[PDB]
Amino acid sequence: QSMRIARLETFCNEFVGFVRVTTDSGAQGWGQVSTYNADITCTIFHRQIAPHALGTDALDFADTLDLIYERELKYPGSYLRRAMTGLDTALWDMRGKLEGKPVATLLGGSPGPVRAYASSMRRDITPEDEAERFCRLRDDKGFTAFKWRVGAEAGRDHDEWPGRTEAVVPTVSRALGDGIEKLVDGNSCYSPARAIEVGKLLQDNGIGHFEEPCPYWEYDQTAAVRAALLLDVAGGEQDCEYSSWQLMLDRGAVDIVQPDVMYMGGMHRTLQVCQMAARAGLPVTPHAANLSLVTMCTMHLLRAIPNAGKYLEFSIEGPEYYPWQEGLFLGDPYRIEGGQAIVTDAPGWGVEISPTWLDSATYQVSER
Amino acid sequence: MRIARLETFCNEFVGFVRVTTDSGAQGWGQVSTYNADITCTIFHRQIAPHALGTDALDFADTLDLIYERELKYPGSYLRRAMTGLDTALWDMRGKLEGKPVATLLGGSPGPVRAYASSMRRDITPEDEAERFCRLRDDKGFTAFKWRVGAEAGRDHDEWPGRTEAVVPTVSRALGDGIEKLVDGNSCYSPARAIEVGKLLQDNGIGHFEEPCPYWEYDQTAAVRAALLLDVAGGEQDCEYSSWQLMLDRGAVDIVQPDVMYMGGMHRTLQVCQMAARAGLPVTPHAANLSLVTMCTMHLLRAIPNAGKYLEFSIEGPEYYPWQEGLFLGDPYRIEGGQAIVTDAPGWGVEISPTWLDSATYQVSE
Structure with a gap:
């Protein structure tokens, strides 16, 4: 059965930020933003990654990451990417746990x-x-x-x-x-x-x-x-x-x-x-x-x-x-x-x- | 003349920067618009620590140095923040020279x-x-x-x-x-x-x-x-x-x-x-x-x-x-x-x- 992203959560300190993703089905997974200045990166995640990823396909998301960059095309380079990683890695872990x-x-x-x-x-x-x-x-x-x-x-x-x-x-x-x-x-x-x-x-x-x-x-x-x-x-x-x-x-x-x-x-x-x-x-x-x-x-x-x-x-x-x-x-x-x-x-x-x-x-x- | 203080004033859309030298001379610049609040957090984290104490009148090389100390951070946000330093300093020197x-x-x-x-x-x-x-x-x-x-x-x-x-x-x-x-x-x-x-x-x-x-x-x-x-x-x-x-x-x-x-x-x-x-x-x-x-x-x-x-x-x-x-x-x-x-x-x-x-x-x- 197909599923959509419902919730994205970050837990951070200055050094490290973990991301928890929840689907409409309740399926969960954990990923992480890039280390270092993780707190700024998590502010960015919620500003610039999460709005575009909510409601999208939780199981086939390569195109969504391209869409994110297209909507935020004014922001090329490291911090957008550092933040995007937290979305990508949580979704692989999610799909991995769903599939065993x-x-x-x-x-x-x-x-x-x-x-x-x-x-x-x-x-x-x-x-x-x-x-x-x-x-x-x-x-x-x-x-x-x-x-x-x-x-x-x-x-x-x-x-x-x-x-x-x-x-x-x-x-x-x-x-x-x-x-x-x-x-x-x-x-x-x-x-x-x-x-x-x-x-x-x-x-x-x-x-x-x-x-x-x-x-x-x-x-x-x-x-x-x-x-x-x-x-x-x-x-x-x-x-x-x-x-x-x-x-x-x-x-x-x-x-x-x-x-x-x-x-x-x-x-x-x-x-x-x-x-x-x-x-x-x-x-x-x-x-x-x-x-x-x-x-x-x-x-x-x-x-x-x-x-x-x-x-x-x-x-x-x-x-x-x-x-x-x-x-x-x-x-x-x-x-x-x-x-x-x-x-x-x-x-x-x-x-x-x-x-x-x-x-x-x-x-x-x-x-x- | 060295850089002594850097202040930012922001909302989500724009952030202004005031520079003060050891002499008290001041100038105003601005970081890039948009997500200016995030940019000013970056400016304090990653631009200001490298610029405090350096030459306020000849700073081209100091901008290259900042990038070298923050080399893991290429691309937009670091530059959005750096414009604030650069522009405040030009304004500062224009005022000192009239x-x-x-x-x-x-x-x-x-x-x-x-x-x-x-x-x-x-x-x-x-x-x-x-x-x-x-x-x-x-x-x-x-x-x-x-x-x-x-x-x-x-x-x-x-x-x-x-x-x-x-x-x-x-x-x-x-x-x-x-x-x-x-x-x-x-x-x-x-x-x-x-x-x-x-x-x-x-x-x-x-x-x-x-x-x-x-x-x-x-x-x-x-x-x-x-x-x-x-x-x-x-x-x-x-x-x-x-x-x-x-x-x-x-x-x-x-x-x-x-x-x-x-x-x-x-x-x-x-x-x-x-x-x-x-x-x-x-x-x-x-x-x-x-x-x-x-x-x-x-x-x-x-x-x-x-x-x-x-x-x-x-x-x-x-x-x-x-x-x-x-x-x-x-x-x-x-x-x-x-x-x-x-x-x-x-x-x-x-x-x-x-x-x-x-x-x-x-x-x-």
């Missing part, structure tokens, strides 16, 4: 394991400290791929401190040893000449993935780096509109595309990027930088797409660095064994948001 | 020819024609823009036959000697925009705005290639990467940045220099009588590659109730189809104290 299927199954895949890479978010850490914590994760959790940071974020060629990059690259790589894949992210730091310099040191050290080596909005700079290096230049975390994915691909900027489900506007839109990459003959290694729902959406997506890259981004930062992601979910949905996460048979996203966190979150509702 | 902003930018005070711009699709051809004839005769406008298709309508018109009727009805009413423009607001596929464009050219319309979805640069380019009239666009482009793709695909004959959607005067100047390198004129978008229109007037008095005319919204206080009484005096007075940038320092505008008194207030310092 994980979202990965709805998408043509199936539950199972996903190989992960251990991802450090920090530049404030020393080479020795990064190496030591990586060694422990390699030995105790079985990770066999690791990503750390070079340069300074949007640093205009300046390093985090002088000599950090020169040290962090060989130090972490020699500690991790043979048989381990290595990735680094420059987060927009370098001009192409310097990124090529740094990129030859990465190659000497066996690092096969150099993410966002140049300002991400200078596509020709990134393409210059990709043309000169043999390692894979990867990028796209902050790209959220199809026109910029297009220019990226047209210019041959990257070897590997890295949309982020939550910055993109949700699964339908990320799938559109994967299919653009597939046409260009490129793998998808999505960005997921915290243990909000973004990591579980990424896992379901990697279980389903035909052109997945090597691994899931898995943030290894603890409660000291993301205190706000502790207690979001019940159970242990992000358990790692042998360097792998698991998509279970549980319907929808397979995760249960704790009622403790919901209880003291900011509530807002739209209905009719 | 010069109009137009003068700071290399131009001077003086008249700007305007086009009367209708925002409505819910108006009949006869009614549109009738109000335009009155504006033509009473206010001296010699150029007019009206609407075709339905906004983002996927080839559907507002009602069947509206475009077929409104094009010749308004053009015949307006008569000889009058420049004519329409805006498709992203309605059409290229084939259909071409058909419509042939009707426009039959009726002497020389400006076809945003014939296809603005984000389909190749469709827009196919339309431009096939028609002899000028295809214009770019109102919703706020990042350089998208303007650069637009210019690369040869999408448009004429660029139409909006100062407030762009993130303000420095960034819109950057678009003007991109267009000037591509050999194209700039006819900016300004769709209401908030401060956007006056910013555009100063920019048109200064740039070397201006198009023919200032977009001038002719909708009355019944369509835009919130813009009535924003400013003292009559800054948007039209005579002979021309607006005037005066010799008054900064933007040359005073915001209503009563409006500010009732506004939502927020401060960062």
Whole structure:
């Protein structure tokens, strides 16, 4: 039997906003807006997403997300997308629970394991400290791929401190040893000449993935780096509109595309990027930088797409660095064994948001 | 001289910004209209923390820095907020120097020819024609823009036959000697925009705005290639990467940045220099009588590659109730189809104290 959206609810703090969708049948599901400035994003959700989605088809909604952008066509770019994600993800979870299927199954895949890479978010850490914590994760959790940071974020060629990059690259790589894949992210730091310099040191050290080596909005700079290096230049975390994915691909900027489900506007839109990459003959290694729902959406997506890259981004930062992601979910949905996460048979996203966190979150509702 | 304080005053529709320097020098700007309340929350969250304490007299690089610190946030809302900083600072420096902003930018005070711009699709051809004839005769406008298709309508018109009727009805009413423009607001596929464009050219319309979805640069380019009239666009482009793709695909004959959607005067100047390198004129978008229109007037008095005319919204206080009484005096007075940038320092505008008194207030310092 067919059904329409009846109610959309958000529960937020500054860091995270969950969305609950209710159909005319009473069927429910839970999703999430992009993390960060989540409170502004939920104000936006109720202003600019909910009015267009109420009363629409709860089970076939790809066209509705296009209609939303057409009605709000004055607002291209990140915050509309950040908000749209909360609608898309709640509806996949809704349909998954109604059908008794994980979202990965709805998408043509199936539950199972996903190989992960251990991802450090920090530049404030020393080479020795990064190496030591990586060694422990390699030995105790079985990770066999690791990503750390070079340069300074949007640093205009300046390093985090002088000599950090020169040290962090060989130090972490020699500690991790043979048989381990290595990735680094420059987060927009370098001009192409310097990124090529740094990129030859990465190659000497066996690092096969150099993410966002140049300002991400200078596509020709990134393409210059990709043309000169043999390692894979990867990028796209902050790209959220199809026109910029297009220019990226047209210019041959990257070897590997890295949309982020939550910055993109949700699964339908990320799938559109994967299919653009597939046409260009490129793998998808999505960005997921915290243990909000973004990591579980990424896992379901990697279980389903035909052109997945090597691994899931898995943030290894603890409660000291993301205190706000502790207690979001019940159970242990992000358990790692042998360097792998698991998509279970549980319907929808397979995760249960704790009622403790919901209880003291900011509530807002739209209905009719 | 460093930036010491930034205040916003808003409702849902508009938000003004007051900047104060360490010297006490002040200026007033405005964030983009629409959802202005959300924009001002953003301004305090993501613009003000980066701008407090920096050089109030040389701030082009500080706007680039802000984007770099907020790099996860590309696209409209960040720029809507950033215009507030940019415009308040230009007004501030115009007041310190006793010069109009137009003068700071290399131009001077003086008249700007305007086009009367209708925002409505819910108006009949006869009614549109009738109000335009009155504006033509009473206010001296010699150029007019009206609407075709339905906004983002996927080839559907507002009602069947509206475009077929409104094009010749308004053009015949307006008569000889009058420049004519329409805006498709992203309605059409290229084939259909071409058909419509042939009707426009039959009726002497020389400006076809945003014939296809603005984000389909190749469709827009196919339309431009096939028609002899000028295809214009770019109102919703706020990042350089998208303007650069637009210019690369040869999408448009004429660029139409909006100062407030762009993130303000420095960034819109950057678009003007991109267009000037591509050999194209700039006819900016300004769709209401908030401060956007006056910013555009100063920019048109200064740039070397201006198009023919200032977009001038002719909708009355019944369509835009919130813009009535924003400013003292009559800054948007039209005579002979021309607006005037005066010799008054900064933007040359005073915001209503009563409006500010009732506004939502927020401060960062």
